[PDB]
């Protein structure tokens, strides 16, 4: 729990903060990312939110593309099991 | 046993990132702007007025405070920007009065000194409000009040806004009488002329000190005496230290000069037979694990961008240690327990739009703090409430009201810090000025108004688009900005921190790097009064 | 000035004496019997149940307590023998629940943990009584309650003795609500399944912690949902789900495993903002001047023989220092002032049959202790079937009540230790279970009943000797033991310490060598609550 | 100004309807059964015991109470059925003790009289519990206690259930000492022999009266020489008053109460009393004896409140629960009654209502007819347990007087939320058709029919339908027997089984007694929002 490996375990995947349009996607289908790497930018009620990488795991897949409307708490990125 | 290892908040920001570079640059400019404006206010009336003031043998108002407080002790000044551009053609630096909290003879006291270099010390409408705010702070925290009296009376051209009403000049004496009845010492130091209502201040004080020749006290000034009775008498003869000290008896102590009077004041406070007692548990202080100046890059000046409030918390609490409460429920609101300079604090901060879950989570947290007598700190960065047909059907208003009602009834000391926007009912739920927080501070990037400037513009752009679509005369897009641009300008101007601070809506604009120090001083002062039991109203379940 | 030399109690026993050798041998056997029986109870349900419990990743109930309390701190377990042979064919080690007082984050707390290895954690009638006793102890001493919840619900075959009455399972939630209203923290950790009706325990708590995978909280189980609505749901999905932690909001903290949950619990207690304050004067502690194990030889196991209670006192009080009150008046009762681990204590102990003078002497002493707010310790050794027991008691009734009435109204903390017999009204006068002593302990040689076994036998031997002498059919001596032997067997069986302790009549059977330590821990816990003023009734002079 | 016209509850039932005819017939039989059983209990030990009792010059225990209370005043007896079939082969009518509330010299008092005709007045385990319940009622309502002492001591064969524990015989003296310290008068009238612990009762009383020859007091058991009125009155000094006979002692007791210098004061507003607009006996047809059928609780309310006037609170929200304000004999009351399964909305509505009554210091009346909580995956996801707990926690902390009446089923956690016995209601009564248990008999049967159907389906040996009732029939019989009102009342779980036609009178007497104590401010715990 102190090791912070737990911080990765607390949530399996990053979800959409609110229902909003996807304005930017910074990750390809297979991309190596480190914690704090921005994955997507979403505007909700004219308010910009940037999604950030939870783990250093490589990205297995992306559930949304640019211009898509993503509902609140819907998975945005799939990460390869390690 | 306190040896348990625990997790700590905060992360290292990306200093190389363009966003951090831009945010730091913008926030730094605001802080520099704030600093230089205070420097100008520091000079009061000006060189000619200051030279005249010293030529009479009197100390400058800020030098008086420096000599009054303990050597090297910090001084927490309040409402430095009162009266900033408030009046069309008159410059009133600091409102003509200097108020703050400092340590005298080891006791925290409220110091209220007239600035005689500003309009001769006349009382403008903002001057009365600033003094009344200081008295309210002193009473709520049981801080002895020291009045360095050097005043020229009320400003006649604006008498209707000074004399008559409940919160007008008359309330000043009412506050003195009430505090005296509660054993909150009232000490007046007449270091200049005081006329009409001014003469009441030394008379209403528990103990009083007057300078040998500078000080003068009289209900009616020489000009009124001549008009009423046709007699010519000097101010010293009509008032003066000797007359009051030896004949009238209004004076309790007689002082040779300003330095002597300040020395006497320190002796008076030392005889108050007061000792501070703490109701809360105390733990050794620890510095935060991250630099405070990083707040410049993290926060910036663009309210449209969002940041994690936990980053702000990580840089002000002891050791960056924070126990979050209901972390995964109502995540738009952050609540948890921490310590600042050893004091326990419950922190409530906005991290997005308020929802029904967020309001419920806040209401639960506030009850916990009140039960354990833990001071509360609010970090307002709001953008409104959730808007939707479903949310109203589920009683979002009912949930939002739950928090307004819990926050109002809480009796633990409350301090509010506006680090972002403050709009609509979100202000009330987060302990706005109307809810009597012990102190309220704002960062230089804050904005406050009934609603955001854009929302008012867009709302009107619906009403008149409707007005002409429904009426039938077409209303074009260029007609839209002849509607929207004046509204946005008005809300930007009236939501500016200086506009809010010029009037006394907050207790000051503070540099983000100074947030931890200001909070530490404020909470320390607020602990001078015992914490009472909280009585709640009906919780509309 | 505390430099005065004083006399000390106690004398060196004759180790060579045959009586001492026999008494030591008998008492030692009882202590060894007590130790090995506890060892068996320590194992709970058994190897198969324990192996299954660990196979699910859960800690054993006693390992949870070891990790919860401060490192190396003593743990005062209560009612270890609850349910010992209570039920005909079912073995319920410790009643299926472990209760005791330990230090968490430097704060004394009451810990109540279900033993899931015993009948899957089902609540037997004794289980409810043991928990209710623990809650009563926590409330009377203002000890925070920590519930390590892992339960299987009520035991249906015995529902009538669990559900309905005032002191039945429902009272558990009533106690939680009352303690919460008094600011006595209620902390629940769901470390396993919470069954129907146990889901309330997490909800009724001030702060709540639930384990990620193991914990399940549901008012209706998956089977009841399946019966009522024909719906099939996994336990994790129905309750104790991420749904309970986030969607439902019942959970305040989310824990990865048992170790994580225990770490979180320690953090929660550290944030209670509580500091212990003592109402009594304190003096440095000193060990008794005589070994404690000598109590084996002095006391023995034969209740017919008599010993000087002063010898017991000399081996438990600090420095064996004792100030006797009214030493030569009513000598069958011993009263005086002493100190245990620095705390002041007034000791009342039996030294023979109670007389009118003894009752008056006790009543006077109890008033003294209540006036000075001094805790009271009672050492019960009532005497039965003596020529002295066969005495006119009309005076004894008139004077005893005065002691029953003073003892009942006393508001100072009271602790009772039964070191011998406890029969009839003598039990009431010496602060029996009915008189709400903070704690009640018994030595392995004690006997308790309405009257001594012999007296009941002899009394019946008068009634039926009369029955047949007055009726006229002769009743012979062999007919006498067909009357007396069953009675003596019954009273011996029902007066046994294990019989008394299996039901919760006392808080545990303690080794005499541990008497000083147990008293020190108990009095220390009892001092967490402020001592109230004592209001007495009418003293029937 | 109180001249406003208002609406009234209640509707005229269809007397011709077959359902009403059947329900009336079934309920009437239960009431007749209740009446005749009480008649038998009225006789106590029996003719031989009663004849022996009178032959000694002593009054019968119930005649003593009749002479003690004010002429013609009603007497509220409690737990008439204590000990009913409780012990296998021993008949103990009323537990060997008679307890109730009556008016003495214009003051409401608790009267506790031993029945010497029943087992010579020996104390059975139920006898101690009944007395302890009476003392608890007296303390909570500040009612003076009068002990008509005629006892034979503890019942030795069952000593382990009488002597040792906290709620055992010892607690009786503890209660006397505590009430005395609170200025709640304790008066003992020794009208017979009292031995061992019995002798403490006169000694622990504030004022004491003993009969000339019948009474005897001694710690250790001729009896007159060892004890007796003369020895205690003149030499021992244990006796404060000396009485020639039972009639004289009762006359002296009335004088003692008149000198208490006590006057009743009311904390609540009072309005003139009015009878309900509908006959009470119609409750027979409306309610019946079949718990599976449902009825509108408002009909019950309309027939007990003054003028059948009722102000409903949150009528359309959480409709399975009914809450509102009314008045009984002029007293203000907040009524909470079940009208279906409890839901999240119902629990929230109840919690809101209880806070209102506590704020205004209004007594609360609960009408329990429960069938359980809503069962469903969605309801649990929405925190039904969290909502249900809100009500358990508000009800527990409420300090206004609380009275509970079980007019139907009382199962599971629904009992707790509706102020069960565990939540210290001032009084708890049950109708003759009520059922109480951890769960309904059918639910326990069906639940087991899932566990063992699973047991043998999962194990693989088939378990047939006839194997099902060899499982279900014993369970249903057990829950029916242990949920019976007489089973519940034989043990002291309630304060009595009352005829529905008497509901209004019993509530009026109970609330009047409960108002002898000042109403305290209510302190709540944390409301888990
Ligand atoms: O009204 C004109 C000025 C001179 C008369 C005013 C009189 S003097 C007595 C009284 N006190 C005042 O302050 N004003 C009036
Ligand atoms: O009665 C047999 C089992 C299925 C029906 C029981 C219902 S479901 C709704 C209500 N809540 C309970 O716990 N039981 C009843």
From Swiss-Prot, chain A:
Subcellular location: Mitochondrion matrix
Post-translational modifications reported in the UniProt record: Acetylated.
Transmembrane segments: none
Modified sites of kind N6-biotinyllysine: 46
Top-level lineage group: Eukaryota
Biotinyl-binding domain: residues covered: 8-80
Subunit description: Probably a dodecamer composed of six biotin-containing alpha subunits (MCCC1) and six beta (MCCC2) subunits. Interacts (via the biotin carboxylation domain) with SIRT4.
Disease linkage: 3-methylcrotonoyl-CoA carboxylase 1 deficiency: An autosomal recessive disorder of leucine catabolism. The phenotype is variable, ranging from neonatal onset with severe neurological involvement to asymptomatic adults. There is a characteristic organic aciduria with massive excretion of 3-hydroxyisovaleric acid and 3-methylcrotonylglycine, usually in combination with a severe secondary carnitine deficiency.
Protein function: Biotin-attachment subunit of the 3-methylcrotonyl-CoA carboxylase, an enzyme that catalyzes the conversion of 3-methylcrotonyl-CoA to 3-methylglutaconyl-CoA, a critical step for leucine and isovaleric acid catabolism.
Protein name: Methylcrotonoyl-CoA carboxylase subunit alpha, mitochondrial
Organism of derivation: Homo sapiens (Human)
Organism phylogeny: Eukaryota, Metazoa, Chordata, Craniata, Vertebrata
From Swiss-Prot, chain D:
Source species, domain of life: Eukaryota
Region Carboxyltransferase, residue ranges: 27-521
Catalyzed chemical reaction(s): 3-methylbut-2-enoyl-CoA + hydrogencarbonate + ATP = 3-methyl-(2E)-glutaconyl-CoA + ADP + phosphate + H(+)
Listed result of changing residue 489 to G: In MCC2D; has some wild-type residual activity
Residue stretches making up the CoA carboxyltransferase C-terminal domain: 275-521
One record GO biological process: coenzyme A metabolic process
Membrane spanning residue stretches: none
Pathway assigned to this chain's UniProt record: Amino-acid degradation; L-leucine degradation; (S)-3-hydroxy-3-methylglutaryl-CoA from 3-isovaleryl-CoA: step 2/3
Recorded disease: 3-methylcrotonoyl-CoA carboxylase 2 deficiency: An autosomal recessive disorder of leucine catabolism. The phenotype is variable, ranging from neonatal onset with severe neurological involvement to asymptomatic adults. There is a characteristic organic aciduria with massive excretion of 3-hydroxyisovaleric acid and 3-methylcrotonylglycine, usually in combination with a severe secondary carnitine deficiency.
Protein name: Methylcrotonoyl-CoA carboxylase beta chain, mitochondrial
Organism from which the protein derives: Homo sapiens (Human)
Lineage: Eukaryota, Metazoa, Chordata, Craniata, Vertebrata
Gene giving rise to this polypeptide: MCCC2
């Amino acid at each position: 729990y102190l090791s912070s490996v737990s911080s990765q375990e607390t949530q399996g995947g990053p979800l959409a903060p609110m229902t909003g349009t996807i304005e930017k996607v910074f990750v390809k289908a297979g991309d190596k990312v480190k914690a704090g790497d921005s994955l997507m930018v979403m505007i909700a009620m004219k308010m910009e939110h940037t999604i950030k990488s939870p783990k250093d795991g490589t990205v297995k897949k992306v559930f949304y593309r640019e211009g898509a409307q993503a509902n609140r708490h819907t998975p945005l990125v799939e990460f390869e099991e390690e | 046993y306190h040896g348990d290892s625990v997790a700590s908040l905060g992360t290292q920001p990306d200093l190389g990132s363009a966003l951090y570079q831009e945010n730091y640059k913008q926030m730094k400019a605001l802080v520099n702007q704030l600093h230089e404006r205070v420097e100008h206010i520091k000079l009061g009336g000006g060189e000619k007025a200051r030279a005249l003031h010293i030529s009479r043998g009197k100390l400058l108002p800020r030098e008086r405070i420096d000599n009054l407080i303990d050597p090297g002790s910090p001084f927490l000044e309040l409402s430095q920007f009162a009266g900033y551009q408030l009046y069309d053609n008159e410059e009133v630096p600091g409102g003509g009065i200097i108020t703050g909290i400092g340590r005298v003879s080891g006791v925290e006291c409220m110091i209220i000194a007239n600035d005689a270099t500003v309009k001769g010390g006349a009382y403008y409408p903002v001057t009365v409000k600033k003094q009344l705010r200081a008295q309210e702070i002193a009473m709520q925290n049981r801080l002895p009040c020291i009045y360095l009296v050097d005043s020229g009376g009320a400003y006649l051209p604006r008498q209707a806004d000074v004399f008559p009403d409940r919160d007008h000049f008359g309330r000043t004496f009412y506050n003195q009488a009430i505090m005296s009845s509660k054993n909150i010492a009232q000490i007046a130091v007449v270091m200049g002329s005081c006329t009409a209502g001014g003469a009441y201040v030394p008379a209403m004080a528990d103990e009083n000190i007057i300078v040998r020749k500078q000080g003068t006290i009289f209900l009616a000034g020489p000009p009124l005496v001549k008009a009423a009775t046709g007699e010519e008498v000097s101010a010293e003869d009509l008032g003066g230290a000797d007359l009051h000290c030896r004949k009238s008896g209004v004076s309790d102590h007689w002082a040779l000069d300003d330095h002597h009077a300040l020395h006497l004041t320190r002796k008076v406070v030392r005889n108050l037979n007061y000792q501070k007692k703490l109701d809360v548990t105390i733990e050794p202080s620890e510095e935060p694990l991250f630099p405070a100046d990083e707040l410049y890059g993290i926060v910036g000046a663009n309210l449209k961008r969002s940041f994690d409030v936990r980053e702000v918390i990580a840089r002000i609490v002891d050791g960056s240690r924070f126990t979050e409460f209901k972390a995964f429920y109502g995540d738009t609101l952050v609540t948890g327990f921490a310590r600042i300079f050893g004091y326990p604090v419950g922190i409530v901060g906005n991290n997005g739009v308020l929802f029904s879950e967020s309001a419920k989570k806040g209401t639960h947290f506030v009850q916990l703090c009140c039960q354990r007598n833990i001071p509360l700190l609010f970090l307002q960065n709001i953008t409104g409430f959730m808007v939707g047909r479903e949310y109203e059907a589920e009683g979002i208003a009912k949930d939002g009201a739950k928090m307004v009602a819990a926050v109002a009834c809480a009796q633990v000391p409350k301090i509010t810090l506006i680090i972002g926007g403050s709009y609509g009912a979100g202000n009330y739920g987060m302990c706005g000025r109307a809810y009597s927080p012990r102190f309220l501070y704002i960062w230089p990037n804050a904005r406050i108004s009934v609603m955001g400037g854009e929302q008012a513009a867009n709302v009107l752009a619906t009403i008149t688009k409707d007005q002409r679509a429904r009426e039938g005369k077409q209303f074009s897009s260029a007609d839209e900005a002849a509607l929207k641009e004046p509204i946005i300008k008005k809300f930007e101007e009236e939501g500016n921190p200086y506009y809010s601070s010029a009037r006394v809506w907050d207790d000051g604009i503070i540099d983000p790097a100074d947030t931890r120090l200001v909070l530490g001083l404020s909470f320390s002062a607020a602990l001078n009064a015992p914490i009472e039991k909280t009585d709640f109203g009906i919780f509309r379940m």
